[PDB]
Design an enzyme around this catalytic site. Structure first.
Site, PDB file in Angstrom:
ATOM      1  N   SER A  20       0.828  -1.205   0.000  1.00  0.00           N
ATOM      2  CA  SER A  20       0.000   0.000   0.000  1.00  0.00           C
ATOM      3  C   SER A  20       0.858   1.247   0.000  1.00  0.00           C
ATOM      4  CB  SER A  20      -0.923   0.047   1.223  1.00  0.00           C
ATOM      5  OG  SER A  20      -1.817  -1.051   1.256  1.00  0.00           O
ATOM      6  N   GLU A  71     -30.283  10.158 -10.917  1.00  0.00           N
ATOM      7  CA  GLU A  71     -29.956  10.005  -9.501  1.00  0.00           C
ATOM      8  C   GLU A  71     -28.639  10.780  -9.267  1.00  0.00           C
ATOM      9  OE1 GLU A  71     -32.348   7.619  -7.887  1.00  0.00           O
ATOM     10  OE2 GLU A  71     -31.040   6.193  -6.779  1.00  0.00           O
TER      11      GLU A  71
HETATM   12  C1  HEM Z   1     -15.318  -2.151  -6.783  1.00  0.00           C
HETATM   13  C2  HEM Z   1     -14.161  -1.307  -7.022  1.00  0.00           C
HETATM   14  C3  HEM Z   1     -13.262  -1.102  -6.020  1.00  0.00           C
HETATM   15  C4  HEM Z   1     -13.069  -1.757  -4.831  1.00  0.00           C
HETATM   16  C5  HEM Z   1     -14.068  -2.642  -4.077  1.00  0.00           C
HETATM   17  C6  HEM Z   1     -11.643  -1.390  -4.466  1.00  0.00           C
HETATM   18  C7  HEM Z   1     -10.932  -1.908  -3.407  1.00  0.00           C
HETATM   19  C8  HEM Z   1      -9.644  -1.623  -3.092  1.00  0.00           C
HETATM   20  C9  HEM Z   1      -8.963  -2.089  -1.924  1.00  0.00           C
HETATM   21  C10 HEM Z   1      -9.366  -3.173  -0.948  1.00  0.00           C
HETATM   22  C11 HEM Z   1      -7.861  -1.442  -1.861  1.00  0.00           C
HETATM   23  C12 HEM Z   1      -6.858  -1.518  -0.768  1.00  0.00           C
HETATM   24  C13 HEM Z   1      -7.071  -0.670   0.463  1.00  0.00           C
HETATM   25  C14 HEM Z   1      -7.076   0.809   0.155  1.00  0.00           C
HETATM   26  O1  HEM Z   1      -5.992   1.373  -0.149  1.00  0.00           O
HETATM   27  O2  HEM Z   1      -8.179   1.401   0.212  1.00  0.00           O
HETATM   28  C15 HEM Z   1      -7.731  -0.768  -3.084  1.00  0.00           C
HETATM   29  C16 HEM Z   1      -6.670   0.057  -3.388  1.00  0.00           C
HETATM   30  C17 HEM Z   1      -6.597   0.983  -4.448  1.00  0.00           C
HETATM   31  N1  HEM Z   1      -7.630   1.191  -5.376  1.00  0.00           N
HETATM   32 FE1  HEM Z   1      -9.370   0.397  -5.382  1.00  0.00          FE
HETATM   33  N2  HEM Z   1     -11.097  -0.443  -5.336  1.00  0.00           N
HETATM   34  C18 HEM Z   1     -12.157  -0.156  -6.159  1.00  0.00           C
HETATM   35  C19 HEM Z   1     -12.115   0.830  -7.110  1.00  0.00           C
HETATM   36  C20 HEM Z   1     -11.029   1.586  -7.451  1.00  0.00           C
HETATM   37  C21 HEM Z   1     -11.186   2.745  -8.272  1.00  0.00           C
HETATM   38  C22 HEM Z   1     -12.452   3.156  -9.007  1.00  0.00           C
HETATM   39  C23 HEM Z   1     -10.021   3.348  -8.216  1.00  0.00           C
HETATM   40  C24 HEM Z   1      -9.738   4.518  -8.844  1.00  0.00           C
HETATM   41  C25 HEM Z   1      -9.684   4.521 -10.374  1.00  0.00           C
HETATM   42  C26 HEM Z   1      -9.146   2.505  -7.432  1.00  0.00           C
HETATM   43  C27 HEM Z   1      -7.857   2.777  -7.145  1.00  0.00           C
HETATM   44  C28 HEM Z   1      -7.133   2.136  -6.193  1.00  0.00           C
HETATM   45  C29 HEM Z   1      -5.784   2.414  -5.852  1.00  0.00           C
HETATM   46  C30 HEM Z   1      -4.930   3.419  -6.560  1.00  0.00           C
HETATM   47  C31 HEM Z   1      -5.426   1.775  -4.753  1.00  0.00           C
HETATM   48  C32 HEM Z   1      -4.100   1.926  -4.083  1.00  0.00           C
HETATM   49  C33 HEM Z   1      -4.272   2.168  -2.612  1.00  0.00           C
HETATM   50  C34 HEM Z   1      -3.110   2.929  -2.026  1.00  0.00           C
HETATM   51  O3  HEM Z   1      -2.939   4.106  -2.420  1.00  0.00           O
HETATM   52  O4  HEM Z   1      -2.371   2.367  -1.179  1.00  0.00           O
HETATM   53  N3  HEM Z   1      -9.808   1.473  -6.885  1.00  0.00           N
HETATM   54  N4  HEM Z   1      -8.885  -0.783  -3.824  1.00  0.00           N
HETATM   55  C1  LIG Z   2     -29.230   5.462 -11.733  1.00  0.00           C
HETATM   56  O1  LIG Z   2     -29.754   5.586 -13.046  1.00  0.00           O
HETATM   57  C2  LIG Z   2     -30.003   6.863 -13.440  1.00  0.00           C
HETATM   58  O2  LIG Z   2     -29.826   7.891 -12.791  1.00  0.00           O
HETATM   59  C3  LIG Z   2     -30.545   6.804 -14.831  1.00  0.00           C
HETATM   60  N1  LIG Z   2     -31.668   7.679 -14.927  1.00  0.00           N
HETATM   61  C4  LIG Z   2     -31.633   8.866 -15.579  1.00  0.00           C
HETATM   62  O3  LIG Z   2     -30.641   9.329 -16.176  1.00  0.00           O
HETATM   63  C5  LIG Z   2     -32.970   9.520 -15.471  1.00  0.00           C
HETATM   64  C6  LIG Z   2     -33.152  10.686 -16.447  1.00  0.00           C
HETATM   65  C7  LIG Z   2     -32.943  10.296 -17.871  1.00  0.00           C
HETATM   66  C8  LIG Z   2     -32.492  11.448 -18.683  1.00  0.00           C
HETATM   67  C9  LIG Z   2     -31.267  11.874 -18.937  1.00  0.00           C
HETATM   68  N2  LIG Z   2     -30.120  11.304 -18.483  1.00  0.00           N
HETATM   69  C10 LIG Z   2     -28.891  11.712 -18.965  1.00  0.00           C
HETATM   70  O4  LIG Z   2     -28.774  12.613 -19.822  1.00  0.00           O
HETATM   71  C11 LIG Z   2     -27.673  11.030 -18.413  1.00  0.00           C
HETATM   72  C12 LIG Z   2     -26.397  11.328 -18.987  1.00  0.00           C
HETATM   73  C13 LIG Z   2     -25.214  10.706 -18.486  1.00  0.00           C
HETATM   74  C14 LIG Z   2     -25.269   9.782 -17.409  1.00  0.00           C
HETATM   75  C15 LIG Z   2     -24.044   9.098 -16.850  1.00  0.00           C
HETATM   76  C16 LIG Z   2     -23.928   7.688 -17.331  1.00  0.00           C
HETATM   77  C17 LIG Z   2     -23.452   7.394 -18.637  1.00  0.00           C
HETATM   78  C18 LIG Z   2     -23.352   6.062 -19.110  1.00  0.00           C
HETATM   79  C19 LIG Z   2     -23.753   5.005 -18.242  1.00  0.00           C
HETATM   80  I1  LIG Z   2     -23.638   3.033 -18.875  1.00  0.00           I
HETATM   81  C20 LIG Z   2     -24.213   5.298 -16.952  1.00  0.00           C
HETATM   82  C21 LIG Z   2     -24.306   6.611 -16.511  1.00  0.00           C
HETATM   83  C22 LIG Z   2     -26.547   9.490 -16.845  1.00  0.00           C
HETATM   84  C23 LIG Z   2     -27.739  10.099 -17.333  1.00  0.00           C
END
Ligand code: HEM
Ligand SMILES: COC(=O)CNC(=O)CCC/C=C\NC(=O)c1ccc(Cc2ccc(I)cc2)cc1
Ligand SMILES: CCCCCCCC/C=C\CCCCCCCC(=O)OC[C@H](COP(=O)(O)OCCN)OC(=O)CCCCCCC/C=C\CCCCCCCC
Ligand SMILES: CCCCCCCC/C=C\CCCCCCCC(=O)OC[C@H](COP(=O)(O)OCCN)OC(=O)CCCCCCC/C=C\CCCCCCCC
Ligand code: HEM
Ligand code: HEM
Ligand SMILES: CCCCCCCCO[C@@H]1O[C@H](CO)[C@@H](O)[C@H](O)[C@H]1O
Ligand SMILES: CCCCCCCCO[C@@H]1O[C@H](CO)[C@@H](O)[C@H](O)[C@H]1O
Lengths: 271, 100, 49, 59, 442, 55, 422, 54
Positions: free
Chosen positions: A97, A163
């Site tokens: 980490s 949402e």
């Molecule tokens: C379902 C998706 C995800 C889950 C459940 C998840 C879970 C985890 C866990 C367990 C860790 C280790 C503990 C921590 O540092 O928090 C981790 C680390 C990390 N995750 Fe995720 N992660 C998710 C999404 C993402 C996303 C969306 C990003 C950003 C694009 C990301 C970037 C990272 C990075 C960079 C670390 C390194 C931690 C550190 O800086 O030490 N993760 N992730």
């Molecule tokens: C939780 O679900 C919602 O909020 C969906 N419901 C709605 O968007 C209700 C209203 C519908 C009308 C317009 N919506 C948008 O223009 C809209 C535009 C971008 C996004 C983000 C997104 C993109 C791809 C993808 I793949 C996902 C998201 C989400 C919604």
């Protein structure tokens, strides 16, 4: 930690897609009009555009086939998330980490257990409280009520907003007044995460020691907050202009102000 | 005038890695060049850098800093690595341009 | 000793074009391979379809 | 020699090997389909709608 | 300048005797010199019954003649300071002496006396029998060679080239005065021998001696004929000799070579220079220019490796041999086969520019002294059919560029079934197929 | 062989090789917690999810 | 178009001897001979000579460990260091049109080494290795011991850094070994295939490190003891010697002849060498395979002389004893005035053939060009050879049987004899 | 380092369990069912989703 990160992004993308499909299942007014607008987003691509949509809906407009296959999707995706989470974590374990000071830590490490297993059980309960507090005392706070009215393919509601977690996107898509522009801006509004790793110019790893970057960072956060709010509001003055700005400023802070402040910073430490 | 100097000094106190007892070069992110340089450090200078960090880490974990009187002062900050690094980099820059 | 050692007779299994220990195996290679490779290449087409 | 010419201009360069399976399969499909369709429409003469078609297709 | 120092080297002179012998030599100023007979003989010309003659002979060629037995021979030679050494490959035996230019004549006489009037005492043979048998129990523990033989033994498998030069254990135990005789009789004949020498000798003065001791002119056309040899079939294959009890493992891979004549051998050697060779002690270290050398060092891939271009009358072997720990044979093999590919696919003008200059000076050091200069002539005439000047060799190298190499190496390496020979605790390396598979794309 | 049955069991070793003996900076904050939460979050959505999908 | 030339040899003010010689060969070979070696090592800084030898490819104030290797390989060059207990030799080889560039490094290596702390400590483990290979030849193991069993200092110091000191040599130690030895007056810039007007322009305009004998070497005290190394190995190697002559001291040429008189190697592959008293002398006592020869070394302020055997362990004894009796019967008027006439040619010869290999030549020119800044024509050397009398020889053989003898062994010395039993 | 088939925390797996995997030089055809079963599973799942979508 590029790989650990990139997976992260894919994960986010999946979650985003996952919730989208889940939300349509209840077949409410939003569900529908949501399902109708979001899929329609692929219709921005030329040639394979209008055509790609068709698979999606499984028709020539949203109907049953869409709903059932969305249920299939929703049922499946989560598992995919759990799977990629395994890759995500597995990549992380090659490097260990990161840490708040941004410097080697080999000089002193501790077993996850019981140091962090305990730190986490607590963390979990500290977040669980509010989330239960809402789902038990104000179930509908975060949820739109318009979705209590069965979908009507004939009437799109007047006050339409997604949402909360999709507002910033929404705002950006709404910022550019062009089918494609909006889509693109949108596409990049998230896809930009992939770039962050190559936009790192500071000689140091964390911001802890870079006040400048820090201010810029919080500026970005807040910038995001606004964009969200803007999505909550209708297309009218001032909102339109405010939205437009905030977007520009979002993209700009990421693409130019961070790398630029980043460098400047180094020169001020004499590197 | 004394501007640059005025500035640098400020930023230095601004970043505040001194509050942790860390010298400018203690906070350097460890890419390949740095890694290499650190290995070239004289036995002691390394063992010393070590302590400083394992000590700063201990702080960050406790959430505390050093009492005012033990902080590093802009002018007493020793760039113990900057020279070894510029050499690693100057060395690498060569290998690279030579492979053409 | 490493001298009392010789490669046995692989004539039972040798391809006819390289069964005579006095003819370059390099002329009849282009074929031996083009063929096995044709089987291969074809199978690949069969799969593709 | 076909096999040699084959091995030289096709099966050798991994790049053109592939390029062959592609342009190759292409022909194969086009051809195969025809055959099977024919072998089939032939084994079932006068029983397919394509055969009965003219008795109602007012033309 | 280099270009010029190149053309000053004295043109090598040659003349033939109406009996078949050919005489050549390069004149210098040195007071010392070297002379020898370069017979185009060897086990390659042997058969299943006489495998071991060229050797058993090479062994008695120094124990006396009929004119002057054991002691007398040695005595007379030692007493004038000369040096008499010799060898015998698969298709090229040679006897040569180093001595003062003063004794130029007296020497030739002796050479002429070993090749023609070899003693062959029955008391001596049954003695050199026990000895060869020993030079085997020993030569057997020289893995590098135990390997190169096996490589031959399966690369050319089934043919004559695929035999050990020292010959079988059974043969050396039963060869007879008779059999030895024939070998000498049937093989050591003037049209197939070359009198070469270098030093401070006059060409005339040399030939003159020849005319006197290498006489015995022939009558029928039969005797003026060079028996052309049966081609040797290359066969992609492997031979694995395992013994996990050995400290290291030796592996050797190869493709069929082009054969002495071919102008491509130049290109090939230019290539082989690019990959060069490496070995533990090389002070070069991680900075060496040979990609393989570099990797070899970076990852402790091997104790040593080397490229080779063994050439023969009609064919040849082309590849490389490395020694490694049981736990790195793989990685190594792999890196190598890759460097081979690189050759065929992306060799750059720099990679070759260096290679050239290297080869250049390597060939120049082939002519460092009288003995080696001589050996160059002995071997040149016998193989190329004349003498190739450094001025020429050089020009032939200045010609080679990337494109050239890429095509040639593809021409001889790309997708060719290889010959494989491994020896030792070789479990980590394990598949002909997999290896075959490594002969294309990269 | 191996002494304790927490480092040689091709399964138990994992829960112990990634959740117990796992080395961690002595100083990671609270912003490192979200990692787990996200996991507990996922694992939890899935439960309520099936339960729901069953109706 | 080219012909003949002359051997020049200038000597700058600081004492840097320059030896040229254009022989128009397509390739040159420049070098830097130096009065250096493991003879100037003190107990406290052993092997520092050795490491200095491998430290050849290490960065200098004008070229990187990298650019030196890649810069030299780029022209098909070569860089090698050769050293005795008392002489180091740095020399590059290459094609004429490139000498210009190979020089920069040859210069930089021997005059401006940086011996960076790390490049160094990162190279020390090599000693463990470089040493391990050489020692595969027992031939070298017994020589190390001999020297130490025949000396009290300087020459007794081992040529390969001792085992205990591997990894404890320092950058400081190396440096002071260069500043205190590689001084202009102990250096010689010898070169082949070059114009003396250039091999010169370099030495002067480019060379720095000041002059002065730096640090005199501890005069060679003779000891004369024995070192027996039991190792269970199948063969027993042994060399029994006594103080011999020194370098250039007339009294050597005698041994150099008494060397050939006793038989110092073979001249006929798989031979019997009858012109070898010693050899033949042993065969008339031993039944199984063995080998013996005349040992002879000449050092600036001392030297060694004797014979070296190799035999099966059971016969090891008699083979050595016979080696002696053959040396006594030789020290006592059993030398034909003709044996002496022969050894003279063998010696005139051997020498003459050593000037064939460019390497062999650059070594003769150098040694001489550094120990005196002179060059004795080949007809003069051959003169100092035949100027040997049957007496000088019978005496050489006598100077042996009387003085204190030193011995060295290795192998199953179960039936091998001690010095006191000869 | 050296090859990117043994050091990649992912690619290493497909290579550590499907390519370099050491197998008795002599397993028969009754060892094949292993894979088939696998291909069988993955295959059912595909037709399965496709179906579940209607
Ligand atoms: C379902 C998706 C995800 C889950 C459940 C998840 C879970 C985890 C866990 C367990 C860790 C280790 C503990 C921590 O540092 O928090 C981790 C680390 C990390 N995750 Fe995720 N992660 C998710 C999404 C993402 C996303 C969306 C990003 C950003 C694009 C990301 C970037 C990272 C990075 C960079 C670390 C390194 C931690 C550190 O800086 O030490 N993760 N992730
Ligand atoms: C939780 O679900 C919602 O909020 C969906 N419901 C709605 O968007 C209700 C209203 C519908 C009308 C317009 N919506 C948008 O223009 C809209 C535009 C971008 C996004 C983000 C997104 C993109 C791809 C993808 I793949 C996902 C998201 C989400 C919604
Ligand atoms: C996206 C959609 C929009 C959603 C809106 C997000 C909700 C907005 C609420 C804001 C969050 C409150 C955070 C306040 C915390 C204040 C604070 O403590 O800051 C200082 C503190 C100082 O730490 P050190 O310098 O390391 O000190 C060393 C030890 N002495 O900094 C921190 O705590 C670290 C910062 C982590 C918080 C990040 C959370 C912000 C969330 C936004 C998402 C941004 C990313 C981009 C997403 C793209 C899609
Ligand atoms: C109109 C039709 C258009 C069709 C478009 C499809 C185009 C796809 C073509 C891809 C190009 C193929 C080229 C592969 C190149 C790799 C290669 O090197 O050869 C193949 C290589 C072997 O190596 P070499 O023979 O030594 O080749 C050396 C070349 N000098 O790999 C192989 O073994 C390929 C053959 C294996 C086939 C496996 C498939 C068998 C399965 C059958 C079940 C049926 C299919 C159902 C699919 C369902 C999918 C959801
Ligand atoms: C991936 C984590 C999950 C997320 C992010 C998620 C999100 C959602 C969302 C946004 C809804 C609409 C909720 C509403 O009506 O207000 C929903 C509904 C639904 N989800 Fe999930 N879900 C997840 C996993 C699953 C899984 C794994 C299943 C079971 C396979 C599941 C089954 C359902 C069902 C039955 C509904 C429809 C009933 C309802 O709307 O309450 N969900 N989900
Ligand atoms: C585990 C492997 C699988 C097995 C052994 C299997 C077997 C079957 C069986 C016995 C039936 C009844 C078939 C019939 O009507 O004759 C069936 C139906 C069905 N299965 Fe599966 N199935 C598998 C996986 C799945 C999966 C992964 C899905 C998708 C989540 C799925 C979706 C369906 C659907 C939609 C039906 C109902 C429609 C139909 O009967 O054709 N199945 N399956
Ligand atoms: C069973 C809990 C698994 C947690 C995911 C981390 C897996 C990475 O663990 C690796 O394999 C080691
Ligand atoms: C991609 C094909 C996967 C086939 C399923 C077999 C899994 O199991 C093995 O355990 C080892 C130790 O944790 C890992 O290093 C290997 O990669 C893994 O295959």
């Amino acid at each position: 930690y590029k790989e650990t990160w990139n997976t992260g992004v894919i994960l986010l993308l999946t979650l985003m897609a996952t919730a989208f499909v889940g939300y349509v299942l209840p077949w409410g007014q939003m569900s529908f009009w949501g399902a109708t607008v979001i899929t329609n987003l692929f219709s921005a691509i030329p040639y394979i555009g209008h055509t790609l949509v068709e698979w999606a809906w499984g028709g020539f407009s949203v109907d049953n086939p869409t709903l059932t296959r969305f249920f299939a999707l929703h049922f499946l995706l989560p598992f995919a998330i759990a799977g990629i989470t395994i890759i995500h974590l597995t990549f992380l374990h090659e490097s260990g980490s990161n840490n708040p000071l941004g410097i080697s830590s080999d000089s002193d490490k501790i077993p996850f257990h019981p140091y962090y297993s305990f730190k986490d059980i607590l963390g979990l309960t500290l977040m669980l409280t509010p989330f239960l507090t809402l789902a038990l005392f104000s179930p509908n706070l975060l949820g739109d009520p318009e979705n209590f009215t069965p979908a009507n393919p004939l009437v799109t509601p007047p006050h339409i907003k997604p949402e909360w977690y999709f507002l910033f996107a929404y705002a950006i898509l709404r910022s550019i007044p062009n089918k494609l522009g909006g889509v693109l801006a949108l596409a990049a509004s998230v896809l930009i995460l992939f770039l962050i790793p190559f936009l790192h110019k500071s000689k140091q790893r964390t911001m802890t020691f870079r006040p400048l970057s820090q201010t810029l960072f919080w500026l970005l956060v807040a910038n995001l907050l606004i964009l969200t709010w803007i999505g909550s509001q209708p297309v009218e003055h001032p909102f339109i202009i405010i939205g437009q700005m905030a977007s520009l400023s979002y993209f700009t802070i990421l693409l130019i102000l961070f790398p630029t402040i980043g460098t400047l910073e180094n020169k001020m430490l004499n590197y | 005038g004394r501007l640059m100097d005025r500035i640098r000094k400020w930023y230095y106190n601004a970043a505040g890695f001194n509050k942790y007892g860390l010298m400018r070069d203690d906070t350097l992110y460890e890419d390949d060049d740095v890694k290499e340089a650190l290995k070239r450090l004289p036995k002691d200078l390394y063992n010393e850098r070590m302590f400083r960090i394992k000590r700063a880490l201990d702080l960050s974990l406790k959430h505390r800093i050093l009492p005012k009187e033990q902080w590093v002062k802009y002018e007493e900050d020793k760039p113990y690595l900057e020279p070894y690094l510029k050499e690693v980099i100057r060395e690498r820059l060569e290998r690279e341009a030579w492979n053409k | 000793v490493h001298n009392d050692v010789t490669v046995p007779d692989f004539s039972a299994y040798r391809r006819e074009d390289v069964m005579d220990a006095t003819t370059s195996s390099q002329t009849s290679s282009e074929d031996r391979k083009g063929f096995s490779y044709l089987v291969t290449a074809t199978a690949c087409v069969a799969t593709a379809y | 020699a076909l096999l040699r010419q084959a091995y030289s201009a096709l099966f050798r360069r991994t790049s053109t090997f592939a390029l062959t399976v592609v342009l190759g399969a292409v022909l194969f499909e086009r051809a195969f389909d025809q055959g099977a369709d024919a072998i089939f429409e032939h084994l079932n003469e006068g029983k397919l709608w394509k055969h009965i078609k003219h008795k109602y297709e007012a033309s | 300048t280099y270009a010029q120092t190149l053309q000053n080297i004295p043109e090598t002179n040659v003349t033939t005797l109406d009996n078949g012998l050919r005489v050549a030599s390069e004149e210098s100023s040195q007071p010392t010199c070297t002379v020898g007979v370069w017979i185009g003989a060897g086990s390659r010309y042997e058969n299943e019954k006489n495998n071991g003659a060229g050797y058993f002979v090479e062994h008695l060629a120094f124990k006396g003649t009929k004119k002057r037995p054991c002691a007398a021979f040695e005595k007379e030679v030692e007493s004038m300071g000369a040096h008499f050494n010799g060898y015998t490959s698969r298709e090229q035996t040679a006897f040569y002496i180093k001595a003062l230019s003063k004794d130029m004549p007296k020497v030739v006489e002796l050479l002429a006396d070993v090749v023609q009037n070899c003693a062959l005492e029955e008391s001596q043979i049954e003695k050199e029998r026990g000895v060869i048998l020993q030079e085997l129990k020993e030569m057997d523990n020289d893995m590098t060679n135990v390997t190169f033989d096996y490589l031959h033994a399966t690369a050319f498998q089934g043919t004559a080239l695929a035999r050990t030069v020292e010959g079988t254990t059974e043969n050396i135990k039963h060869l007879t005065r008779a059999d030895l005789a024939s070998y000498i009789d049937t093989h050591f004949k003037a049209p197939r021998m070359v009198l070469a020498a270098a030093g401070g000798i006059s060409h005339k003065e040399l030939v003159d001696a020849a005319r006197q001791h290498f006489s015995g002119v022939s009558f029928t056309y039969k005797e003026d004929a060079v028996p052309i040899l049966p081609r040797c079939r290359f066969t992609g294959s492997e031979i694995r000799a395992r013994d996990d009890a050995l400290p290291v493992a030796h592996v050797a891979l190869a493709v069929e070579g082009p054969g002495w004549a071919d102008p491509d051998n130049v290109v090939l050697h230019v290539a082989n220079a690019i990959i060069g060779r490496y070995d533990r002690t090389f002070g070069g270290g991680k900075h060496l220019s040979s990609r393989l050398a570099a990797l070899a060092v970076e990852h402790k891939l091997c104790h040593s490796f080397q490229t080779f271009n063994t050439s023969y009358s009609d064919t040849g072997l082309f590849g490389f041999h490395f020694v490694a720990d049981p736990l790195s044979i793989d990685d190594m093999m792999f890196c190598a086969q890759g460097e081979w590919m690189r050759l065929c696919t992306s060799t750059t003008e720099s990679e070759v520019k260096r290679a050239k200059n290297h080869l250049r000076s390597a060939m120049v050091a082939q002519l460092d002294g009288t003995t080696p200069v001589c050996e160059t002539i002995g071997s040149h005439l016998l193989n190329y059919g004349r003498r190739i000047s450094l001025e020429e060799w050089d020009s032939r190298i200045s010609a080679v560029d990337a494109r050239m190499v890429r095509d040639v190496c593809s021409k001889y390496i790309y997708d060719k079934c290889p010959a494989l020979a491994a020896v030792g605790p070789i479990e980590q390396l394990l598949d002909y197929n997999r290896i075959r598979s490594g002969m294309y794309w990269i | 062989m191996a002494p304790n049955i927490r480092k040689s069991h091709p399964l138990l070793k994992m829960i112990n090789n990634s959740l117990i003996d796992l080395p961690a900076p002595s100083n990671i904050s609270a912003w490192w917690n979200f990692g787990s939460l996200l996991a507990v979050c996922l694992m939890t959505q899935i439960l309520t999810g099936l339960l729901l999908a069953m109706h | 178009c080219p012909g003949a030339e002359d051997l020049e040899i200038t000597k700058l003010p600081n004492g840097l001897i320059i030896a040229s010689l254009e022989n128009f060969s397509p390739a040159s070979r420049i070098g830097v001979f130096i009065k250096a070696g493991s003879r100037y090592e003190t107990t406290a800084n052993l092997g520092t000579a050795h490491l200095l030898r491998l430290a050849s490819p290490l960065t200098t104030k004008g070229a990187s460990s990298f650019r030196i290797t890649r810069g030299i390989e780029a022209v098909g060059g070569s860089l090698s260091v050769y050293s005795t207990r008392e002489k180091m030799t740095y020399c590059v080889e290459c094609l004429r049109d490139h000498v210009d560039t190979v020089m920069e490094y040859l210069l930089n290596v021997t005059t401006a080494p940086e011996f960076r702390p790390w490049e160094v400590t990162d190279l020390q483990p090599q000693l463990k290795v470089d040493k391990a290979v050489a020692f595969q030849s027992p031939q070298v193991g017994v020589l190390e011991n001999l020297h130490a069993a025949a000396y009290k200092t300087a020459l007794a110091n081992p040529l390969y850094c001792p085992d205990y000191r591997i990894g404890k040599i320092t950058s400081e130690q190396l440096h002071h070994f260069v500043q205190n030895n590689f001084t202009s007056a102990r250096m010689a810039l010898v070169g082949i295939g070059v114009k003396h007007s250039d091999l010169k322009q370099v030495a002067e305009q480019f060379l720095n490190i000041r002059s002065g004998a730096g640090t005199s070497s501890a005069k060679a005290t003779y000891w004369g003891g024995e070192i027996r190394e039991q190792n269970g190995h199948s063969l027993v190697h042994a060399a029994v010697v006594t103080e011999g002559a020194a370098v250039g001291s007339a009294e050597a040429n005698a041994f150099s002849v008494l060397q050939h008189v006793l038989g110092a190697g073979p001249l006929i592959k798989r031979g019997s060498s009858v012109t070898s008293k010693l050899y033949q002398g042993v065969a008339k006592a031993t039944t199984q395979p063995f080998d013996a020869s005349a040992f002879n070394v000449n050092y600036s302020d001392s030297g060694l002389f004797g014979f070296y055997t190799i035999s099966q362990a059971a016969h090891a004894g008699e083979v050595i004893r016979a080696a002696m009796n053959q040396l006594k019967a030789a020290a006592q008027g059993g030398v034909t005035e003709e044996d002496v006439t022969k050894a003279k040619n063998q010696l005139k010869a051997t020498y003459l053939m050593s000037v064939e290999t460019a390497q062999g030549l650059l070594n003769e020119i150098g040694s001489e060009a550094l120990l005196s800044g002179t060059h004795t024509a080949p007809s003069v050397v051959a003169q100092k050879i035949d100027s040997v009398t049957s007496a000088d020889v019978v005496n050489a053989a006598k100077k042996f049987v009387s003085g204190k003898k030193s011995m060295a062994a290795s192998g199953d010395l179960g039936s091998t004899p001690f010095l006191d039993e000869l």
